[PDB]
Design a protein around this motif. Structure first.
Motif, PDB file in Angstrom:
ATOM      1  N   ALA B  18       0.891  -1.334   0.053  1.00  0.00           N
ATOM      2  CA  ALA B  18      -0.127   0.155  -0.001  1.00  0.00           C
ATOM      3  C   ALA B  18       0.948   1.197  -0.058  1.00  0.00           C
ATOM      4  O   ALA B  18       1.764   1.397   0.848  1.00  0.00           O
ATOM      5  CB  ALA B  18      -0.697  -0.140   1.229  1.00  0.00           C
ATOM      6  N   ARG B  19       0.416   2.181  -0.534  1.00  0.00           N
ATOM      7  CA  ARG B  19       1.240   3.472  -0.815  1.00  0.00           C
ATOM      8  C   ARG B  19       0.305   4.836  -0.639  1.00  0.00           C
ATOM      9  O   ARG B  19      -0.957   4.771  -0.854  1.00  0.00           O
ATOM     10  CB  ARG B  19       1.763   3.730  -2.000  1.00  0.00           C
ATOM     11  CG  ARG B  19       2.739   2.822  -2.415  1.00  0.00           C
ATOM     12  CD  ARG B  19       3.052   2.918  -3.696  1.00  0.00           C
ATOM     13  NE  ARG B  19       4.010   4.462  -3.881  1.00  0.00           N
ATOM     14  CZ  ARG B  19       4.469   5.186  -5.061  1.00  0.00           C
ATOM     15  NH1 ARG B  19       4.306   4.644  -6.077  1.00  0.00           N
ATOM     16  NH2 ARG B  19       5.084   6.287  -4.528  1.00  0.00           N
ATOM     17  N   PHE B  20       0.805   5.701   0.383  1.00  0.00           N
ATOM     18  CA  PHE B  20       0.336   6.967   0.442  1.00  0.00           C
ATOM     19  C   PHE B  20       0.567   8.071   0.116  1.00  0.00           C
ATOM     20  O   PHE B  20       1.972   8.056  -0.241  1.00  0.00           O
ATOM     21  CB  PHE B  20       0.070   6.950   2.284  1.00  0.00           C
ATOM     22  CG  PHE B  20      -0.865   6.273   2.872  1.00  0.00           C
ATOM     23  CD1 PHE B  20      -1.667   5.266   2.014  1.00  0.00           C
ATOM     24  CD2 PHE B  20      -0.480   5.600   4.103  1.00  0.00           C
ATOM     25  CE1 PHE B  20      -2.654   4.352   2.740  1.00  0.00           C
ATOM     26  CE2 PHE B  20      -1.482   4.672   4.608  1.00  0.00           C
ATOM     27  CZ  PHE B  20      -2.329   4.130   4.013  1.00  0.00           C
ATOM     28  N   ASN B  21      -0.049   8.934  -0.721  1.00  0.00           N
ATOM     29  CA  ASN B  21       0.436  10.118  -1.274  1.00  0.00           C
ATOM     30  C   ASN B  21       1.222  11.191  -0.409  1.00  0.00           C
ATOM     31  O   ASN B  21       1.217  10.793   0.580  1.00  0.00           O
ATOM     32  CB  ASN B  21      -0.640  10.780  -2.274  1.00  0.00           C
ATOM     33  CG  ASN B  21      -0.181  11.566  -3.257  1.00  0.00           C
ATOM     34  OD1 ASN B  21       0.870  11.969  -3.332  1.00  0.00           O
ATOM     35  ND2 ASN B  21      -1.204  11.804  -4.351  1.00  0.00           N
ATOM     36  N   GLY B  24      -0.685  12.503   2.812  1.00  0.00           N
ATOM     37  CA  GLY B  24      -1.203  11.404   3.672  1.00  0.00           C
ATOM     38  C   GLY B  24      -2.596  10.886   2.845  1.00  0.00           C
ATOM     39  O   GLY B  24      -3.237  10.090   3.881  1.00  0.00           O
ATOM     40  N   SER B  25      -3.069  11.321   1.704  1.00  0.00           N
ATOM     41  CA  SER B  25      -3.999  11.001   1.114  1.00  0.00           C
ATOM     42  C   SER B  25      -3.566   9.641   0.553  1.00  0.00           C
ATOM     43  O   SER B  25      -2.411   9.442   0.069  1.00  0.00           O
ATOM     44  CB  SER B  25      -4.502  11.930   0.020  1.00  0.00           C
ATOM     45  OG  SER B  25      -3.437  12.015  -0.865  1.00  0.00           O
ATOM     46  N   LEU B  26      -4.554   8.675   0.473  1.00  0.00           N
ATOM     47  CA  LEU B  26      -4.032   7.247  -0.236  1.00  0.00           C
ATOM     48  C   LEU B  26      -3.861   7.558  -1.572  1.00  0.00           C
ATOM     49  O   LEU B  26      -4.542   8.489  -2.441  1.00  0.00           O
ATOM     50  CB  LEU B  26      -5.111   6.490   0.035  1.00  0.00           C
ATOM     51  CG  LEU B  26      -4.863   4.822  -0.218  1.00  0.00           C
ATOM     52  CD1 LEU B  26      -5.616   3.872   0.741  1.00  0.00           C
ATOM     53  CD2 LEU B  26      -5.407   4.441  -1.559  1.00  0.00           C
ATOM     54  N   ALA B  27      -2.742   6.613  -2.039  1.00  0.00           N
ATOM     55  CA  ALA B  27      -2.354   6.562  -3.382  1.00  0.00           C
ATOM     56  C   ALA B  27      -3.042   5.631  -4.264  1.00  0.00           C
ATOM     57  O   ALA B  27      -3.983   5.532  -5.107  1.00  0.00           O
ATOM     58  CB  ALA B  27      -1.124   6.737  -3.792  1.00  0.00           C
TER      59      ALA B  27
END
Lengths: 100, 50
Positions: B18-21, B24-27
């Motif tokens: 999982a990656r967050f932008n 802190g918004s999810l990517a």
């Protein structure tokens, strides 16, 4: 009472087997039927056919991680009865009820 | 119970990521779905979608 034909062979005991498939669905089970003679003047050689559900289905026996328990039981059959004349009752549409 | 198809491959475990932008918004996140067979007589191959 007796059950099995010959050769195992106490008369009382049947020794079958049963297998459950990979996900707990039943695979197969044997014997599917039972000769049964009460040996008490009742008509000999009644042929029961035990049923434990179709192959590959939850409807019958099912293996599972949870603790084993019995559930359900049902069968054909009655006991002899007799009519009691004092209570009859005709109804609407004119068929005559009776209460054994 | 089992989950994953093949080849990782203990049957129990999924290994996604999982990656967050930047703020802190999810990517993105993977896998978005899960095959799941209880293996207790319940209907096999339920398809959850996390």
């Amino acid at each position: 009472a007796e059950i099995n034909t010959t050769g195992e062979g106490p008369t009382n005991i049947i020794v079958g087997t049963a297998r459950f498939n990979n996900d707990g669905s039943l695979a197969n089970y044997t014997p599917k039927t039972i000769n049964f003679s009460p040996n008490n003047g009742a008509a000999p050689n009644q042929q029961i056919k035990l049923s434990f559900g179709t192959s590959g289905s939850n409807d019958g026996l099912v293996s599972s991680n949870s603790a084993s328990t019995l559930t359900g039981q049902a069968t054909d059959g009655y006991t002899s009865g007799n009519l009691k004349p004092d209570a009859i009752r005709v109804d609407d549409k004119g068929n005559i009820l009776g209460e054994f």
